Amino acid sequence: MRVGPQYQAVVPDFDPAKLARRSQERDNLGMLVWSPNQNLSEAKLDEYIAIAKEKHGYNMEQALGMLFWHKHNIEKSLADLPNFTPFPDEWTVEDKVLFEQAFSFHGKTFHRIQQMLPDKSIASLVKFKT
Amino acid sequence: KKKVCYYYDGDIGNYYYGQGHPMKPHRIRMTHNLLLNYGLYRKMEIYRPHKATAEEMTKYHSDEYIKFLRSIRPDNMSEYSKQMQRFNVGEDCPVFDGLFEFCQLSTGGSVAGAVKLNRQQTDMAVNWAGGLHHAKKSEASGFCYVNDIVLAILELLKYHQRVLYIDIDIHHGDGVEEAFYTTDRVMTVSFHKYGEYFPGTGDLRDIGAGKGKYYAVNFPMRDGIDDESYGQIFKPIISKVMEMYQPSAVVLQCGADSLSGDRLGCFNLTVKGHAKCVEVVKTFNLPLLMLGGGGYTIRNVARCWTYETAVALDCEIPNELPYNDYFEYFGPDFKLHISPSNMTNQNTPEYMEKIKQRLFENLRMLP
Amino acid sequence: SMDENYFVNYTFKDRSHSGRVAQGIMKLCLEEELFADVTISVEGREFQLHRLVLSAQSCFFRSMFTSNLKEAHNRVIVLQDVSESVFQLLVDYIYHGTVKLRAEELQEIYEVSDMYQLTSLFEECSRFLARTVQVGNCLQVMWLADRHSDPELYTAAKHCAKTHLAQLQNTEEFLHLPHRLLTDIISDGVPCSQNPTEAIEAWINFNKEEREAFAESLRTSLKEIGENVHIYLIGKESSRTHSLAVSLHCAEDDSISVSGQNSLCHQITAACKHGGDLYVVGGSIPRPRRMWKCNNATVDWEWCAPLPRDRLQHTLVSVPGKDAIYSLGGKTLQDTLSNAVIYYRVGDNVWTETTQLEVAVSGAAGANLNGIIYLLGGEENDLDFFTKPSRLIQCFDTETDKCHVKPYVLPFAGRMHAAVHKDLVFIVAEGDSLVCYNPLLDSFTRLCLPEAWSSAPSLWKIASCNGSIYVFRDRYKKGDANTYKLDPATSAVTVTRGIKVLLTNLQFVLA
Amino acid sequence: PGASMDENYFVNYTFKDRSHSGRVAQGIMKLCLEEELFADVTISVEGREFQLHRLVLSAQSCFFRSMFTSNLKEAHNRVIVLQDVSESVFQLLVDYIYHGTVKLRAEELQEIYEVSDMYQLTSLFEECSRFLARTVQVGNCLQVMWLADRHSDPELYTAAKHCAKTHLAQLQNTEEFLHLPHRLLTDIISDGVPCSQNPTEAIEAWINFNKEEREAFAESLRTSLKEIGENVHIYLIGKESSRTHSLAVSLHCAEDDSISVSGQNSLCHQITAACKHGGDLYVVGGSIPRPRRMWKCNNATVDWEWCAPLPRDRLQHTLVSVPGKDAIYSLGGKTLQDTLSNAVIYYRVGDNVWTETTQLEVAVSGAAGANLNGIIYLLGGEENDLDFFTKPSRLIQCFDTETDKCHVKPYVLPFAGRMHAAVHKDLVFIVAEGDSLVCYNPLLDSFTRLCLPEAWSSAPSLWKIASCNGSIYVFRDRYKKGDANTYKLDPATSAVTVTRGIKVLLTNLQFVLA
Ligand SMILES: O=P(O)(O)O[C@H]1[C@H](OP(=O)(O)O)[C@@H](OP(=O)(O)O)[C@@H](OP(=O)(O)O)[C@H](OP(=O)(O)O)[C@H]1OP(=O)(O)O
C-alpha cells in the first residue's frame, strides 16, 4: 500500500447546493439504440421479429433497432426493411480458403495472417468451431 | 419495477490481447447474444457507449501515461522500450492492435452509466465491458490499463456525498482501494483470496490511511469457499456497512473468476451463489452500477453475467439455454447453471467468525 | 507421577544406559575377551563366545542354549552349514553391530542370516541383493527369494526378469524353471518388445509330454503393456523459439532414442512426470499458476486446475502410491521464501493443502522413495533479509503427512539435480561431483567425475533407466549431443549417441 | 560424515545397525530378569543370595570388573560376600545395572550415594549428588559437607557450604560445628557470610572451644573473613487502586522464615517489562508509540547517562538476566503491527550496547522466562494461528547463551496461556490460572504437579511465584480488602501456609521479580 499524492486520486470538494443543480444539461453520453414501449404487445413484437428474420435475414438486434427507428410502429417497419438490407461481411470462399491456409502456416497470429490477407483488418480477422 | 440501462459496443469483442493470454474480450459478445436470445434485451434501455476522450481519462491518470497509451502501437514498440518498462506495459499487459479504443469503450460505458445515475434517469446501470480494477494512476497492472471504476466513482462523487464500492472478484481491488485510500467519501469493501496470491495486497490490517482511516474493509479468504459460506459472510457485513456508512450510491464489481472451474481462480461458487450478492445489494434501493471484471472460463462468465442481468431486471429465465450464435460453446449439457467441484473448503467457521468479528469491531469506529 | 516429587522421591531413568551397556560389552568381549562360557567350532576353528549376547541377538541361539540338546550341552557346538569367514562376519556383527558387506559373499550371508534369525542383517542383505540383481542371476535370485519367503526380493527379481525376457529364452535356467514361477513372471505384464509369446512356446516345447495342458492358463494370463520407460527433455530449440518437450524411450540395452515431440506455446516455471504423462506449470510471471497435461499419444495439452497459490522455483514431485502431485516450497512474487505444501489429485482434478515445511526453501530438488519426499539443497533464508545456498535435507512423509529435518547435511550446497536409482538418490551439483545418498543408512558416497569438463561451470542433469544413470549437459555446444552413461557398480562413464534433436537449452529433465 | 570413496552400495560398503544397542539392552533385561538364564556368579549380601552375570556387572562398573577379573584364587570363588552395602541398597543397584532405571528416595539417599561412589557407578552417583544438593538444609548441612569432602564432590560441597554459610547464626552454637576442622571452617568463612550471621562471634566461640591449639589459627580467620551485602531480594512493583504511579517495593527475607519490606521507590512511567539483574532493578518502559525507554535514572542510581534504549519497538517481550555473561536478554514479544516477533537481543551491562542474536524457532509473546545455568527457557505465552490472530501457547523453547542456539522441546507444558516461572534449586516452578503448580526438571525432561489451595479459585486472579531460601512464595494479583494474601509453600512436604505480617499496600501486582 503506497500513500502519496501521485498514488491517490484528487476527489472533488463537496458542494451540497451544487448536487441537485446540474442534472439536466451539459452532456448525455451514449447513443440510444433501443427503448422499451409498454403499449407494444408481446405477440406483435414476436411476429415482427419472425417476419423480419424470414423476410430479409434480419437478426433480432437489427429488427429491434429498425423498430425503434420508426417510433415503435410495426406498420412503417414492415415496409422499410427491403429499402436498405444490411449486407454482412462479404467473406468469399476464396478468402476463407486463404484464411485457413494462413492459420495453418502461422496460427493465431493475426498480425502475420494480415500479411497475406491485407484487404482485411485485424478486427475482421478476430471476428472471423471447426 | 425499476429501470435498467445496458451499455454495449459491438466492436468490443474484436480486440485480441494475444495468443495464450487468458483475457478474452469475446466473453462480452457471447453474454450479449445470450441476453438477446433469452429475451432480456427487450426489457431494458440499450445504449452505444461513447469513446472516452483522453481528457476524461486524465481526471485520474497522469498525462504522460495516457499519452503513452495513445502513442504506443505494435509497429513502433522499438522506440518506447524505456517507456514500456516505466509504465508496466508489454509483459502481462501486452501491446495489441486497438488497445486505446478498447480502453476508451470500457471507460465510456462506465462513465456514461454514472452520468445516467447522477441525473436520476435510471435505477440501475450495467456495463460488462468495464470493471478493470487493477490499473494504477500511472502504470498498468493485472490485464488493465485504464481504471474506469475510479473515473466512474469520481463522476458519482459530483452528486453523492458517500459512495460504497463492493468487489466480489477473487482478486483484491488494489487499484480502486489505493486511489481512495485517504478519503472517507468512498468506502471500498473487498472479498478476496489472500496468501501468496495476486496482487499481494489486501491484508486484514489494512483499514485506511490519514483522513480515510476505517474506510477500507478487507475480507481475506482461503481456497474452495462455497455458496453457503459466502452467503453467510456477505449479507451480515454488507448490512453492517449499510448501517454504519449509510452511502447514497453503490458500485458493484461482479468478477466471475470466483466461480467454480475457472482457469485462474480457486473458489467453489456457482452462478446462483454469485448472483445472491446482486440480490442482496439490490434490497437497499440505492443507485447501482453493475460492472464486469475477471473471469477466464468464458462460457461460465457468459452464464454468470446473463443470470445477474436477469436478476437485476427481476426476470426469471429457464435453465435451458436458448439457440444463439455460440450454442457450441455451452455443450454438452446446454444448461445455464453450473455444478460445484469437490474441493475442500479451508474457511473453517472459527476463522470466518473471527474475521467477521474483527471487521465488525473495525466498522464500529466510524465517526 | 502424582505422588512423585523431586524433593522426597522420584524415578530416575538413565538415557545413556543402553549405549553404555553395548559399548562395555564390545570393549570387554573384543579387546580382552573374558567370561567366555561357550565354544563354537566352525571348520576346525574354535570361537570362545558368550551365550548371553548370542541369545539376546537371535532366537536360534536362544533356543539352542535354553532348550539344550546332546550336541549343544556337552562341551562345544559344531556348526557345519556356515564357513569360517562368514561366521566371523556374523560374530563381528553380533558383538559390534557393524559389518562390512561385499557382493562376493552376499548370498551366503543372506542364507545364514535367515537360518540364524538375524532379521536386521537379513533385511540389509535382501536390500543389497535387490540392488545388484541383473540378467545373469535373475532366476537364481528368484529361486532364493521364493525359498526364503522374501517378497520384496522376489518382486525385484521378477521385475528384472520380465524386462529381459527375450534374452532369457535361450538359457536352460529359464527352460527348467517350474510353472508357478513362470505365472508370476508372466502375470505382472511383459513388455511387447521381449516377445513373451515366443518365450511361452519355447518353454512349453522344451518338454511337451506333461506341459501342454498348461497352455490355456499361460496364454490367458499373458499381459502386454506399452512403453513404460520415459524421459522428458523440455528445452528450447534453435529454430522454434517457444519451447519443445521431447520424449525418450530406453531399450533393454540402455540406449535412449527420441519417440516424439510437442512444442509448448507457454512459458514454464515447473514440470513433472507423473506416470507416463507430463505436467507443466506456468503462464505468466505475475500469475504462474496455470497447469497443463500432455500425452505422447494425444499430441495436445489439456488444461488442469490452477494452483491455489502462485510461486516461483517450487518443487513438483509425483507420488504414484497415492496418485498425486506435490508442490513444496517456492518463492513468492514479493521475494519471500515459502514453506507451504499442496498436492494435486489426478483422479479428482483438485488441489489440496497439507502441513507446511519446517524450513522455507526454494530451488530444492525433490525425490520420492516409497512414498517419502526428500527436499535436497536449494536456497535457505539468510539472516540479513537475504538468501544463501542450502545444504540440509527435509523429509516429508506422505502417508502420515509429517515433515522432518535430517540432522546431517549434504556434502555440497546450492542448486542440484536428483534422480532415484533403486533405493538410492543420486545427486549432482555444480563442481563435477556425483553423490549417492542412502536415506535408510543416513550415508553418502561420492563418485568421481572426470575433470575434462571442469572448465565450463554448467548445470548437470541426471536421469535413470533400467540399471544405469544418464547425465545431461545444460549448455550444449553447437552440433554436440553430449550425454554420458554412468554404471554405478564400476563408476565408468561413456559418451552416448542417438540423440538428433538440437536442443540448445535444457530446462527440465523429468525422470 | 563425509561421502566415502572406498565404499559403493553396488560392490562393497559398511553396514551399521542403529538398533543394535537397544536390542542388546532389551535382550539383556529379558534374559537376566524375566527368565534368569546364564547366571555365572553369586553375590551374598546380609544372607541374601544374588544370581548375577559377570559380564553385565563388569560392563557397568570398574570395581566389579577388577573384582571379577582378578585372575587368582579370589576370582574363581563360589560365593563373594559384600559388607559395606545393605540388602535394599544392593537390590536398587542391581535394578539400576540391569534395567537402567531406579526409584530414588530421601531415606536411602546417603547410602546409595556412598555405594555408587564406591562401585564406580558414575551416572547414578551424579544423580544422587544432585538429589542430595537439592534437599540440603540446616539439620544436615555440615554432615553433607563432610560427606562430600570424603567423596571429592565439588558441586555438593559448594551447595552444602552455601547452606551452612547462609545460616551460620544457628550453627554457631551447635555441637557439630564446635569440632569442625580448620580447613572446613576456613572454607565456610572465606566464602562470604551475611552480616546478620555475626561470623566474629562464631569464630570467637570456635577459638574459645580449644584455645591451646587453635590460637595460632585466629589471625588467619580474621584476615580471610570477608563479608557481603544483602542480595536475597524480591522486587515486586504494582499500581495502587487510587494512585496512577507504579511503586517498586524491595523485600529482604532472612533465614528465619520471615519476609519484610526493605524499601520503596516510586516511578511515574507505564512499564511493559522489567527484570532483576544482580541486586539492582532494570525497567523497560516508554510512551506509545515508542516503548523502548530503558531506565537509568531514579533516586537509587542518581544518574542520567541514557541507558541504551532497545533497538526494537516490541510489547510483551521477556527480560531474562544472565549473570554469567552480565547480560539481559530481550526475547520474543509483539510488535506494534499486531504481529508476533522472534527477535532476540541482549544488553551487556559493562558495554551498555544492545546486540542482536539468533532468532527463536517460533514467535511468541508473554512467555515466562527462566535462566538455568546459562540456558534460557521460554514457557507458554501466545502463538499465532488462523493467521491473523493469536492462540495460547504451551511450548517450551531453550536458548543456550554459550553456543547461541535455539531449540523446541518435543514435549509440551501441561497447561497453556500466561504463566509465571521461578527457578528454585536447579528446578523451574511454573504457575498459571487454575490453582495448579508445576515443577519442571529440564535434565530429566519431566514434570511433577502440586495442587495449590483451591479455596479461592472462582476469582479471575493471576498467581505470581518467587523462590526464596528453600521456600516458595505465591502472590495473589487480586488482593482483597485488608487481606495481603501471600502463601508460603515448602516443596518437600507440599504444605502451604499463610504469611501475615508482610504489609503490601499494592492492590494490583504488575511484576514479581526474583
Ligand atoms: O493458450 P491461450 O492463449 O490461453 O488460448 C487458448 C486458445 O487460443 P489460441 O488458439 O490462440 O491458442 C483459446 O481459443 P481462442 O480464444 O483463441 O478462440 C481457447 O480458449 P476459449 O475456449 O476460452 O476461447 C483455449 O482454451 P480451451 O482449451 O478451453 O479451448 C486456450 O487455452 P489452451 O492453451 O488450453 O489451448
Subunits next to D (3 or more Cβ pairs <8 Å) are B, C
| C-alpha of residue C232 to centroid of ligand 1, in Å | 24
Q: Is D74 on the interface with C (CB under 8 A)?
A: no
Q: List, as residue ranges, the binding site of B.
A: 20, 24, 167, 169, 171, 180, 183, 186, 190-191, 215, 257, 263
Q: Which residues in chain B have Cβ-Cβ distances shorter than 8 Å to D389?
A: 354, 358
Let me know whether D90 and D128 are in one domain: yes
| C-alpha of residue C246 to centroid of ligand 1, in Å | 23
Instruction: Please tell me chain D's helix, strand, coil percentages from 3-state DSSP, rounded to the nearest 5.
Output: 25, 35, 40
Yes or no: say if D20 and C99 are a contact pair by the CB < 8 Å rule.
no
CB atoms within 10 A of CB D68: 21
Residues with CB under 6 A from ligand 1: A 108; B 19-22, 24, 298; C 301, 303
Find the radius of gyration of the CA atoms of chain A.
24
User: Whose CA is closest to D514, among D450, D461, D471?
Assistant: D471
CB contact under 8 A, B354 and D388: yes
CB contact under 8 A, C309 and B343: no
Measured in whole angstroms, the distance separating CA D452 from the mean position of its chain's CA atoms is 21
User: Whose CA is closest to B335, among B317, B350, B320, B325?
Assistant: B320
Q: Is C99 on the interface with D (CB under 8 A)?
A: yes
Q: For residue B296, give the ligand 1 atom closest to its CA.
A: 23
Place of cell 492462540: D391
Q: Is B134 a catalytic residue?
A: yes
* β-pairing verdict for C341-345 and C224-225: unpaired
Q: What is the 3-state secondary structure (H, E, C) of B207-270?
A: CCCHHHCCCEEEEEECCCCCHHHHHHHHHHHHHHHHHHHCCCEEEEECCHHHECCCCCCCCCEC
**What residues form DSSP beta bridges with D365?**
D382
Residue of B34, B47, B141, B150 for testing the chain A interface, max A β-carbons within 10 Å: B47
Let me know whether D307 and D438 are in one domain: no
State residue D422 phi and psi, 5-degree precision: -140, 135
Residue nearest to atom 3 of ligand 1 (CA): B20
CB contact under 8 A, B354 and D386: yes
Tell me the C-alpha to C-alpha distance, in Å, between residue B178 and each of B133, B206, C102: 10, 11, 70
Is residue C116 situated within a structural domain? Answer: yes
Residue nearest to atom 2 of ligand 1 (CA): B20
CB contact under 8 A, D3 and C445: yes
Mutate to test the pocket of ligand 1, among A99, A103, A108 (most ligand atoms within 8 A of CB): A108
Long-range CB contacts (< 8 A, 24+ apart) of A42-47? A44/A74, A45/B42
Quote the Cα angle for B344-B345-B349, to 5°. Answer: 145
Subunits next to A (3 or more Cβ pairs <8 Å) are B
Residue B326 exposure: Cα atoms within 13 Å on the Cβ side = 18
Tell me the C-alpha to C-alpha distance, in Å, between residue B137 and each of B91, B146, C6: 19, 8, 70
Mutate to test the pocket of ligand 1, among B14, B17, B23, B24 (most ligand atoms within 8 A of CB): B24
Cα–Cα distance measured from residue C127 to residue C151, given in angstroms and rounded to the nearest whole number: 11
Cα–Cα distance measured from residue D246 to residue D435, given in angstroms and rounded to the nearest whole number: 27
Residue of B219, B351, B356 for testing the chain D interface, max D β-carbons within 10 Å: B351
Let me know whether D389 and D327 are in one domain: yes
Tell me the C-alpha to C-alpha distance, in Å, between residue D492 and each of A13, D106, D135, D142, D431: 77, 10, 8, 20, 17
- Full DSSP string of B102-121: HHHHHHHHHHHHHHHHHTT-
| C-alpha of residue A99 to centroid of ligand 1, in Å | 18
**Domain end: D100, D133, D166, which one?**
D133
Residue nearest to atom 1 of ligand 1 (CA): B20
Nearest CA in chain B to D390: B354
Q: Which residues in chain C have Cβ-Cβ distances shorter than 8 Å to D358?
A: 383
Place of cell 530446462: C507
Q: Rounded to a whole number, what is the distance in Å from the CA of A11 to chain B's nearest CA? A: 7
Cα–Cα distance measured from residue C211 to residue A62, given in angstroms and rounded to the nearest whole number: 83
Q: Is C401 on the interface with B (CB under 8 A)?
A: no
Which residue segment(s) compose the domain that B240 sits in? 4-363
User: Whose CA is closest to C267, among C249, C280, C252, C250?
Assistant: C280
Cα–Cα distance measured from residue B335 to residue B322, given in angstroms and rounded to the nearest whole number: 9
Residues of chain B with a CB closer than 8 angstroms to some CB in chain C: 19-20, 22, 91-92, 142, 195-200, 223, 262-266, 341-344, 346
CB contact under 8 A, A30 and B160: no
Q: Is C302 on the interface with B (CB under 8 A)?
A: no
Quote the Cα angle for D22-D23-D24, to 5°. Answer: 90
Let me know whether D316 and D362 are in one domain: yes
Q: Which residues are within 8 A (CB) of B137 and not within 5 positions of it... i.e. 6 or more apart?
A: A6, A7, A8, A9, B60, B61, B62, B65, B178, B179
Nearest CA in chain D to C33: D55
State residue C492 phi and psi, 5-degree precision: -110, 125
Give Dmax over CA atoms of chain D in angstroms: 87
- Catalytic pick among B26, B134, B160, B192: B134
Which member of B19, B60, B112 has the closest CB to residue A109? B19
Q: Which residues in chain B have Cβ-Cβ distances shorter than 8 Å to C401?
A: none
Is residue D240 situated within a structural domain? Answer: no
Let me know whether D446 and D476 are in one domain: yes
| 3-class secondary structure, D463 | strand
Let me know whether D127 and D105 are in one domain: yes
Let me know whether D72 and D172 are in one domain: no
**Angle between the B27-38 and B298-312 helix axes, to the nearest 10 degrees?**
40
What is the domain count for chain B?
A: 1
Let me know whether D273 and D410 are in one domain: yes
Quote the Cα angle for B265-B266-B272, to 5°. Answer: 85
Let me know whether C32 and C172 are in one domain: no
Q: Is C6 on the interface with D (CB under 8 A)?
A: yes
Q: Which residues in chain D have Cβ-Cβ distances shorter than 8 Å to B195?
A: 387
Q: Is C206 on the interface with D (CB under 8 A)?
A: no
CB atoms within 10 A of CB A67: 22
Helix (H) or strand (E) holding B363: helix B349-363
Let me know whether C282 and C422 are in one domain: yes
Cα–Cα distance measured from residue C381 to residue C359, given in angstroms and rounded to the nearest whole number: 9
CB contact under 8 A, B355 and D388: yes
**What residues form DSSP beta bridges with C249?**
C257
CB contact under 8 A, B264 and C289: yes
| 3-class secondary structure, C436 | strand
Is residue D258 situated within a structural domain? Answer: no
Domain positions in chain A: 42-83, 93-127
What is the domain count for chain D?
A: 4
Q: For residue B18, give the ligand 1 atom closest to its CA.
A: 3
Q: For residue B27, give the ligand 1 atom closest to its CA.
A: 23
Q: What is the CATH number of the domain that holds D207?
A: 1.25.40.420
Q: What is the CATH number of the domain that holds D111?
A: 3.30.710.10
D/A Cβ contact: 3+ pairs below 8 Å: no
Is residue C145 situated within a structural domain? Answer: yes
Q: List, as residue ranges, the binding site of B for Zn(2+).
A: 169, 171, 257
Give Dmax over CA atoms of chain B in angstroms: 55
Q: What is the CATH number of the domain that holds B281?
A: 3.40.800.20
Which residue segment(s) compose the domain that D126 sits in? 20-133
Helix (H) or strand (E) holding D298: none
Is residue D4 situated within a structural domain? Answer: no
Cα–Cα distance measured from residue B188 to residue C245, given in angstroms and rounded to the nearest whole number: 46
E strands along C390-478, which residues?
392-397, 402-409, 416-421, 424-429, 433-438, 443-448, 460-465, 468-473
Q: For residue A108, give the ligand 1 atom closest to its CA.
A: 11
Resolution in A: 2.9
Let me know whether C286 and C190 are in one domain: no
CB contact under 8 A, A33 and B185: no
The coordinates were experimentally obtained by: cryo-EM
Mutate to test the pocket of ligand 1, among C242, C265, C298 (most ligand atoms within 8 A of CB): C265
**Domain end: D418, D443, D478, which one?**
D418
Nearest CA in chain B to C267: B20
| C-alpha of residue B6 to centroid of ligand 1, in Å | 28
Long-range CB contacts (< 8 A, 24+ apart) of D267-273? D267/D237, D267/D295, D267/D298, D269/D293, D269/D295, D270/D246, D271/D237, D271/D246, D271/D510, D271/D511, D272/D315, D272/D316, D272/D317, D273/D316, D273/D317, D273/D318, D273/D319, D273/D330
Q: Is D500 on the interface with C (CB under 8 A)?
A: no
Let me know whether D152 and D207 are in one domain: yes
Task: Record the cell numbers describing residue B307, joined without a space.
Answer: 443470470
Q: Rounded to a whole number, what is the distance in Å from the CA of C308 to chain B's nearest CA? A: 6
